[PDB]
Amino acid sequence: VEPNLHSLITSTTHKWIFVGGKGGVGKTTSSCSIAIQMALSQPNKQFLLISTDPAHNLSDAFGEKFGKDARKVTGMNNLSCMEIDPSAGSIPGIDEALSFMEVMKHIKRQEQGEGETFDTVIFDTAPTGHTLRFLQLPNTLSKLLEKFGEITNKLGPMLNSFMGISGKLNELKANVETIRQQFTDPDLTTFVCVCISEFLSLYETERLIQELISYDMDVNSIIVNQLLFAENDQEHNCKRCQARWKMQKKYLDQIDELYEDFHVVKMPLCAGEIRGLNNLTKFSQFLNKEYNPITDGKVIYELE
């Protein structure tokens, strides 16, 4: 497992890119990063980065106004941003459905009014609310149909046909199709999680991944930003910084043992927050090639 998102950044088949991470763990950043890395690596395909965060993180990350109307980020003719409001208890799945169905209407609407078509969409999942809850209802209720359909086959079909397997077939057809909307091919859809080496973060991450696995949604990418690596930076000293990383190193080992076959890309900590297309691309380069605190120390103390 290469601690990078190369295979994904250079993938031309993927058309559904998920990006989650509750806890103000730099979700917005990773999202813009993964979107830029894929757009630059595949200039022969249109990409769309959409967010639902009411804080308009994408507009504050790039430095330009992004609305419900998809607009190409200035300087790039391959990447586009979208900031919509996904809102402007009896039956499970319904609510989630309405929410997602609406976001997809905003997608097809922006592909007709200029933009034409985006090959791969970068979903910047909301900060809170399991917007992927409906990723299990369709398989749920369906399987119940199967228990329903079969059982409804009293002794027979000898006598059931004298008073009346189209049911056992159409069910299996409505079954697969449904399971094909969740499974949505691991080569076509994937989920990228973001976090940091901190107790609470791991707790949030561990559960998030469980939730996705119950959705059968492919997950094999864990982003961990804010890492110090204070044992290599050329300008040592500062116990305060060394102590903090000693703690981050503790958990990081729990992550490398918890997610052994996962793409755990460890991102470096930057002085201030990274904003602007420029500082973003230079920081997202580490998502393609591992960050080396021994040599890439310059690029970091550069964004400062």
């Binding site: 499974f183 991944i209 939730e211 696995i213 119950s214 492919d218 094999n220 076959d261």
Partner: protein, 291 residues
């Protein structure tokens, strides 16, 4: 998911062919536990099973055995019902088991218990028993094999006649009552589970081998479709053969007459006859000891 599982399975069996057993075992379980935690049983089942297979193929009973138990746990957690697929996985794993594995019996028990809880068989799935029986026999656990074969399939019946035949042959000093001690087991066991077909076939195969090896004095008696290999030097075998057919008639009179003519045998198989008389003749009165 499907493309990811397949991949890792190689990097696992790569750690096994490299010697890294601990690494291979620890990693797989933690990852498997994750699937189970998300209720993605199906995925865990294939992963666990595959991992157990490789371990057993690498002569690593420790890990192999452990994984089998873990698999079973999921089986009960996923309420996996007893069917071809479900049984197949266990059969495939039982085949790679080392007859000397210190856990053998435990593994076997666990598998069978599962089959009992998720099937209509009070003692477990027949087919499954066929495999289990052979495994037990490889570890010299004859008595345990006998039981499973008794409650197995047609092949089990053949392997039960071979188990009894290879045992009879192992006896250095054969006697008239010796051949009965083995042969009777076939007649009684199958008659209890009321499997007349197996009782007759097991009988024919065993009585024919006995005739082609010991060359005893006999003569086949045929009457109304039925046959009774009358041995001139084995009364025990004659009695036993009549007992079989008698039960098939379910007629009290015949059962009483047969016992009254063979008083000695009626006391040797006291308990056994008492049962047969209740299952085939509706007799509630206990068996009065002749001697």
């Amino acid at each position: 998911m499907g493309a990811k599982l397949a991949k890792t399975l190689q990097r696992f069996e790569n750690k096994i062919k490299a010697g890294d057993y601990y690494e291979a075992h620890q990693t797989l379980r933690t990852i498997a536990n994750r699937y189970v935690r998300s209720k993605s049983y199906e995925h865990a089942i294939e992963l666990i099973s595959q991992g157990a297979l490789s371990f057993l193929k690498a002569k690593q009973g420790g890990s192999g055995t452990d994984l089998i138990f873990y698999l079973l746990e999921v089986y009960d957690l996923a309420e996996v019902k007893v069917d071809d697929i479900s049984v197949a996985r266990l059969v495939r794993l039982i085949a790679e088991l080392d007859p000397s594995e210190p856990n053998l019996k435990d593994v076997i028990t666990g598998m069978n218990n599962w089959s009992i809880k998720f099937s209509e068989y009070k003692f477990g799935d027949p087919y499954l028993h066929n495999t289990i029986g052979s495994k037990l026999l490889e570890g010299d656990f004859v008595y345990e094999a006998e039981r499973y074969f008794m409650l197995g399939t047609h092949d089990s019946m053949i392997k039960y006649v071979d188990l009894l035949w290879d045992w009879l042959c192992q006896v250095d000093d054969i006697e008239d009552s010796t051949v009965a001690e083995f042969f009777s087991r076939l007649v009684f066991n199958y008659l209890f589970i009321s499997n007349i077909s197996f009782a007759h076939e097991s009988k024919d195969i065993f009585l024919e081998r006995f005739i082609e090896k010991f060359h005893p004095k006999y003569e086949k008696i045929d009457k109304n479709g039925y046959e009774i290999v009358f041995f001139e030097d084995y009364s025990d075998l004659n009695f036993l053969q009549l007992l079989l057919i008698t039960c098939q008639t379910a007629d009290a009179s015949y059962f009483l007459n047969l016992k009254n003519h063979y008083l000695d045998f009626s006391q040797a198989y006291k308990s056994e006859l008492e049962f047969l008389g209740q299952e085939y003749f509706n007799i509630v009165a206990p068996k009065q000891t002749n001697f």
